[PDB]
């Protein structure tokens, strides 16, 4: 009957920002929005307004499991080494969405480090290596592993930007008493991750806009007018300091994803090809305790705020309620009557 | 709309059963419902019709962290041992809900084991040890640890049924070449969990109703008439076999939880004290490809189905849509028209 479509209004409600709500990279609670000027690209769990995506990783933090790929360890002695596993891009047969990666693989560029030094930034997760042919894993290798994308493995390792021509790498950061080198081998890494750090302090918000890998054919965020794109922050645990409660003893680490997961779940099923007229964005109205803000949502899944050329984190501590408004064009500047 | 709170027909819709929507113990898709004859009692992430919880563990799979608790190891040599951590039930000062357990600690009674033989079922997790006083975690000890509740540690370790008068315990299932013995020590365990199985063929759904720990003062699910309580299964990986896929090469392990997590997320905020008159349940109508089954939701937060005295797992593969019905009393028997 009549308009047999759904407006994109009820998926982003009041308790998505001051309560429950998680990111696309870690399953961390959203405490901030931080703008970036210049743009960024994310395509992992980023769903556009149609029923499609450009990437792997169905919206769920379950598991990373890969079966075929080569393993190695350096040194002539098979005692207290760093296990290094590699596969090429396009060998993931088990993933029904995209062949370029196993489901849940982090889309960051590998940093080249060697020796006993803990690497700065990155993506580490707890996991183990398992043999093929009705797999039972080896007992004497369970460790934290840093995964990512490289070129020229296992020799001169360089970070990669584009997924085409790249190869997925997985190097342990801690010592392990056994190292295998069998050609059929795989990984089993939990989906939720932490950030590896040399000492405490606070590196930067991770990722930076330039380190994020993109597949070919990805839509990029661009600042239109005085509006600029935002990125959702979450307080995540680190390896240099396990007790990273949001209090004293330096600023806690912030990890940033692209869009809220509730939005990814509620967008995946429905088609919104006519629900928002291109050239505009759908705008919500956040009301704090001492101000208010307008937040937009385009045809590509990106979120906009009219901060301009500022890189300051905006805290949803005093946020109370949101409210739908409708479509509004991109030439109109979203308001920035904040508490300051 | 400020008073006279709404009926809960919106928290359970059609994509919960055949799409997104996870469990309470594990983060997996709900592949079926299984009826337990006799009843059960889960009080970890359980919220009633009135908004209240009787227990710890806020509804989010984050991580498990503690600061106070002692670590020890057997053997005269500090090489290839099994670490042994314990703390008493009540030292969770940082927990703002209740003191009796740290946040995210599973409600599994401890299965006592000794030696290279891995235990039968349980809750293991990839984790590490860490020391207090601005201390980072130790590099050389990261392993899979099984967690639980014991009595009489570190001597004769016994499984525990009641949460009161107990102590939380954690020990490694594999070998690690180092052990620490400081009095202040703590865990860091990922919140997602798996089940350690020795031979791993068909086995048994975990946890059983005789293995779930309970806080004192819990409400207990009872079969009223022909309606039995049900409990939602999911596919969970095992330590013996990484490929725990729903296909060929052996039947799968079904990990079971009390109520779905979108239901707990939508019901941890709203209050439904006047929405449903007690003594009845809010019944829906699931429509499969060849039949229909009615599922009721009581005031305790439990789910009821009229399957009878059967332990057959009902597969949600052909389920299409869910239409709400509303309030219906406990004397009425739910239908079980199945193909």
Swiss-Prot record, chain A:
It is found in: Virion; Host cytoplasm. Coiled coil: none annotated. Homomultimer. Interacts with host type II histo-blood group structures antigens at the surface of target cells. Capsid protein VP60 self assembles to form an icosahedral capsid with a T=3 symmetry, about 35 nm in diameter, and consisting of 180 capsid proteins. A smaller form of capsid with a diameter of 23 nm might be capsid proteins assembled as icosahedron with T=1 symmetry. The capsid encapsulate VP2 proteins and genomic or subgenomic RNA. Attaches virion to target cells by binding histo-blood group antigens, inducing endocytosis of the viral particle. Acidification of the endosome induces conformational change of capsid protein thereby injecting virus genomic RNA into host cytoplasm. This is Capsid protein VP60.
Curated annotation (Swiss-Prot), chain B:
It comes from the Viruses. It is found in: Virion; Host cytoplasm. Homomultimer. Interacts with host type II histo-blood group structures antigens at the surface of target cells. Capsid protein VP60 self assembles to form an icosahedral capsid with a T=3 symmetry, about 35 nm in diameter, and consisting of 180 capsid proteins. A smaller form of capsid with a diameter of 23 nm might be capsid proteins assembled as icosahedron with T=1 symmetry. The capsid encapsulate VP2 proteins and genomic or subgenomic RNA. Attaches virion to target cells by binding histo-blood group antigens, inducing endocytosis of the viral particle. Acidification of the endosome induces conformational change of capsid protein thereby injecting virus genomic RNA into host cytoplasm. This is Capsid protein VP60. The lineage of its organism: Viruses, Riboviria, Orthornavirae, Pisuviricota, Pisoniviricetes. The chain holds residues 1997 to 2335 of 2344 of the full protein.
């Amino acid at each position: 009957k009549t308009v047999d479509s759904i407006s994109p209004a009820g998926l982003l409600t009041t308790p998505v920002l001051t309560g429950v709500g998680n990111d696309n990279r870690w399953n961390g609670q959203i405490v901030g929005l931080q703008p970036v000027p210049g743009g960024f690209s994310t395509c992992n769990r980023h769903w556009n307004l149609n029923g499609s995506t450009y990437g792997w990783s169905s919206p769920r933090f379950a598991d990373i499991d890969h079966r075929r790929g080569s393993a190695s360890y350096p040194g002539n002695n098979a005692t207290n080494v760093l296990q290094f596993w590699y596969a090429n891009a396009g060998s993931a047969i088990d993933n029904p969405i995209s062949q370029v990666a196993p489901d849940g693989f982090p889309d960051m560029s590998f940093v080249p480090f060697n020796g006993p030094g803990i690497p700065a930034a990155g993506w580490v997760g707890f996991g183990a290596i398992w043999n093929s042919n009705s797999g039972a894993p080896n007992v004497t290798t369970v460790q934290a592993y840093e995964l990512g994308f490289a070129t020229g493995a296992p020799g001169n390792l360089q970070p990669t930007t584009n997924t085409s021509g790249s190869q997925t790498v997985a190097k342990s950061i801690y010592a392990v008493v056994t190292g295998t080198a069998q050609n059929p081998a795989g990984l089993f890494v939990m989906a939720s991750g932490v950030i590896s750090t040399p000492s405490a302090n606070a590196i930067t918000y991770t990722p930076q806009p330039d380190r994020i890998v993109t597949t070919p054919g990805t839509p990029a965020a661009a600042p239109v007018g005085k509006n600029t794109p935002i990125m959702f922050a979450s307080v995540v645990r680190r390896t240099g300091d396990v007790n990273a409660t949001a209090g004293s003893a330096n600023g806690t680490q912030y990890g940033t994803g692209s869009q809220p997961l509730p939005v990814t779940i509620g967008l995946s099923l429905n088609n919104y090809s006519s629900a928002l007229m291109p050239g505009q964005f759908f705008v919500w109205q956040l009301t704090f305790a001492s101000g208010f803000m307008e937040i937009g949502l385009s045809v590509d899944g990106y979120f906009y705020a009219g901060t301009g050329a500022s890189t300051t984190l905006i805290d949803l501590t005093e946020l109370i309620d949101v409210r739908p408004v409708g479509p509004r064009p991109s030439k109109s500047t979203l308001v920035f009557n904040l508490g300051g």
